[PDB]
Amino acid sequence: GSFTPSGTTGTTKLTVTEECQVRVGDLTVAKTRGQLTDAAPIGPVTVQALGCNARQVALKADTDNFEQGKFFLISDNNRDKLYVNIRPMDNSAWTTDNGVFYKNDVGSWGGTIGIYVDGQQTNTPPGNYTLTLTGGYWAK
Amino acid sequence: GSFTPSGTTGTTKLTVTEECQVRVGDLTVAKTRGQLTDAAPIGPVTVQALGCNARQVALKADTDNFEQGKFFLISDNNRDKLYVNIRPMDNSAWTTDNGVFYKNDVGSWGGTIGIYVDGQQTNTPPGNYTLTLTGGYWAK
Amino acid sequence: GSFTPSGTTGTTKLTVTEECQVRVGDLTVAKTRGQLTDAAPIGPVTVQALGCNARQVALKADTDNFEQGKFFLISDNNRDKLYVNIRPMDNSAWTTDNGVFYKNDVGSWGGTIGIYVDGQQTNTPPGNYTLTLTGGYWAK
Ligand SMILES: [Cl-]
Ligand SMILES: [Cl-]
Ligand SMILES: [Cl-]
Numbered sequence: 001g002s003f004t005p006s007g008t009t010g011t012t013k014l015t016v017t018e019e020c021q022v023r024v025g026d027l028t029v030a031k032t033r034g035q036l037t038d039a040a041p042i043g044p045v046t047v048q049a050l051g052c053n054a055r056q057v058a059l060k061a062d063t064d065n066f067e068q069g070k071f072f073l074i075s076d077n078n079r080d081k082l083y084v085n086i087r088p089m090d091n092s093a094w095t096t097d098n099g100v101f102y103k104n105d106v107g108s109w110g111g112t113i114g115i116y117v118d119g120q121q122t123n124t125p126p127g128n129y130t131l132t133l134t135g136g137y138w139a140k
Numbered sequence: 141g142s143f144t145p146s147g148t149t150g151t152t153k154l155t156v157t158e159e160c161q162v163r164v165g166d167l168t169v170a171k172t173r174g175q176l177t178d179a180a181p182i183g184p185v186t187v188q189a190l191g192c193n194a195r196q197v198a199l200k201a202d203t204d205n206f207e208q209g210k211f212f213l214i215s216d217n218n219r220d221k222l223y224v225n226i227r228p229m230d231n232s233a234w235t236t237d238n239g240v241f242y243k244n245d246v247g248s249w250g251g252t253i254g255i256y257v258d259g260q261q262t263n264t265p266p267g268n269y270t271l272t273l274t275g276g277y278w279a280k
Numbered sequence: 281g282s283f284t285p286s287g288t289t290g291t292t293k294l295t296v297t298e299e300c301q302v303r304v305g306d307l308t309v310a311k312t313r314g315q316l317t318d319a320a321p322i323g324p325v326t327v328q329a330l331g332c333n334a335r336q337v338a339l340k341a342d343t344d345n346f347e348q349g350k351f352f353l354i355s356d357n358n359r360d361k362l363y364v365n366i367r368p369m370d371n372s373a374w375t376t377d378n379g380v381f382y383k384n385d386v387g388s389w390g391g392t393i394g395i396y397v398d399g400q401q402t403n404t405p406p407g408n409y410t411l412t413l414t415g416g417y418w419a420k
Contacts, residue, residue, distance in 0.1 A: 006158040006266055010165020018286040020332035022415025024339060025290020025325055032331075045165055051172075052160035059164060126286055135162025146298040146406055150305020185305055191312075192300035199304060275302025 003060050003100045007135020012043040012115055014073060014082065014129045033122050040117040042073070042084060045133060048110040055137035057109045058102035059086075062132040066099035070118070073129035080125050083118035102138040143200050143240045147275020152183040152255055154213060154222065154269045173262050180257040182213070182224060185273060188250040195277035197249045198242035199226075202272040206239035210258070213269035220265050223258035242278040283340050283380045287415020292323040292395055294353060294362065294409045313402050320397040322353070322364060325413060328390040335417035337389045338382035339366075342412040346379035350398070353409035360405050363398035382418040 015030040023030060029043050049057040064074045072081040086101050088094065089112045093104045103109055115131065155170040163170060169183050189197040204214045212221040226241050228234065229252045233244045243249055255271065295310040303310060309323050329337040344354045352361040366381050368374065369392045373384045383389055395411065 004158065006160060007162030008155045008157075008164055008166075008168050008170055009268070015288045017288075017415075018284065018417070020286060020329070020335040020417045022287030022327065022329040022332065022337055022339075022417065024288055024327050024413050024415035026288075028288050030288055047162065047164050049160070049162040052162065055160040057162055059162075128289070133164050135157075135164035137158070137160045137162065144298065146300060147302030148295045148297075148304055148306075148308050148310055149408070187302065187304050189300070189302040192302065195300040197302055199302075273304050275297075275304035277298070277300045277302065 001138055001140025003058050003102070003136055003138050005060070005134060005136045009132060009134045010045045011133070012045055012073065012131040014042050016082070016124055016126045016129060018126055033124055033126065036082070036117050036121050036124055038117060038120045042115045042117065044115060045113040047113055047135065049108045049135070052106070052108045052137055054106055055139070056103050056106050058100055058136050058138040059113070059133045060136060061099045063099070065131050069096060071131065073131040075125070076128045080127060082121060082124050082129050084115050084131065085118045087114045087116070088112070089114055100138060141278055141280025143198050143242070143276055143278050145200070145274060145276045149272060149274045150185045151273070152185055152213065152271040154182050156222070156264055156266045156269060158266055173264055173266065176222070176257050176261050176264055178257060178260045182255045182257065184255060185253040187253055187275065189248045189275070192246070192248045192277055194246055195279070196243050196246050198240055198276050198278040199253070199273045200276060201239045203239070205271050209236060211271065213271040215265070216268045220267060222261060222264050222269050224255050224271065225258045227254045227256070228252070229254055240278060281418055281420025283338050283382070283416055283418050285340070285414060285416045289412060289414045290325045291413070292325055292353065292411040294322050296362070296404055296406045296409060298406055313404055313406065316362070316397050316401050316404055318397060318400045322395045322397065324395060325393040327393055327415065329388045329415070332386070332388045332417055334386055335419070336383050336386050338380055338416050338418040339393070339413045340416060341379045343379070345411050349376060351411065353411040355405070356408045360407060362401060362404050362409050364395050364411065365398045367394045367396070368392070369394055380418060
């Protein structure tokens with residue numbers, strides 16, 4: 001089925017730095033390549049579906065954030081990637097399908113969407129990584 | 141007369157969604173096409189003119205936010221538009237002139253600038269709409 | 281030596297306005313051309329170096345923010361510039377070298393980086409000026 005854009009767009013930003021890391025300006029999520037182990041949590045993302053009691057809540061990553069059934073934060077150079085798994089902190093089940101991550105069952109779902117590093121990638125070049133998600137519902 | 145750029149730039153963002161609306165990430169102004177009735181308030185915009193006791197306070201919409209004496213929020217695709225009226229919450233009178241919205245009389249004016257949907261547009265495609273306003277004064 | 285990108289990116293924004301200045305929307309740093317005197321402080325920038333006890337903390341301005349040993353905020357038109365000096369509020373000593381501003385001695389330094397107008401420039405056109413700084417360490 002096809003995702004129907006219907007919601008705001010969230011983003012997970014992560015700055016990857018060497019062991020000696022300098023934080024200039026405002027605070028953001030930063031990590032040393034060393035901490036980029038498998039299952040290492042990045043940020044999280046809050047979600048609140050409204051009036052979706054008859055539709056399946058969904059999230060759609062930007063086209064540069066998913067390929068071949070895998071989500072990854074993209075660098076400011078649109079080259080380097082940080083592969084991550086997307087999972088809700090509750091029991092709930094979801095299905096991934098071409099960048100879309102939709103809930104298996106209807107309901108005005110809400111809560112947090114965890115994002116963890118997908119397999120140790122301690123060799124990821126330092127830089128500014130982003131993952132953009134757009135809310136919406138889904139049908140086939 | 142011509143508007144003289146002299147101030148910061150404010151923005152009114154609105155995300156238009158279907159009835160089943162999902163809010164991913166940080167909170168912002170969102171609305172279902174259904175709520176886009178006439179006079180339906182969007183956001184508002186705060187304004188504070190300083191040292192303008194001898195000049196007429198003014199606001200200038202981006203070139204993509206006004207045409208032929210009408211302001212409209214533009215979509216991220218620079219195609220879809222949401223027509224809106226711009227009005228101050230006080231008695232004060234203003235004059236619209238080629239994207240500029242200036243106060244009829246001088247004075248270091250301040251307060252809120254309301255933005256309401258201009259005529260029912262419940263068929264406006266879902267997406268991210270923006271209206272950019274720049275502060276300044278005006279003379280002829 | 282060469283700067284090693286390793287940290288987040290801070291920014292100093294300043295809106296330059298005429299004497300009659302209108303602040304539309306959210307609040308930001310604004311100044312009238314008149315206030316752009318020599319040594320007139322703009323914003324400041326917070327810095328926190330971590331695990332840098334064996335490396336020299338550093339800051340690197342965007343390529344459009346420095347030339348020939350001088351930093352300057354750039355306008356949204358990538359033309360107008362506001363020359364500024366960069367200095368830490370503490371006794372500490374630093375060295376400028378091709379857009380990089382690095383600490384003379386190692387140590388996980390932290391604190392504030394002052395930014396003051398470099399010589400009276402009361403004729404700087406009104407507009408939106410920015411200075412982008414990226415954290416990191418430095419070696420030769
Ligand atoms: Cl998490
Ligand atoms: Cl309003
Ligand atoms: Cl300062």
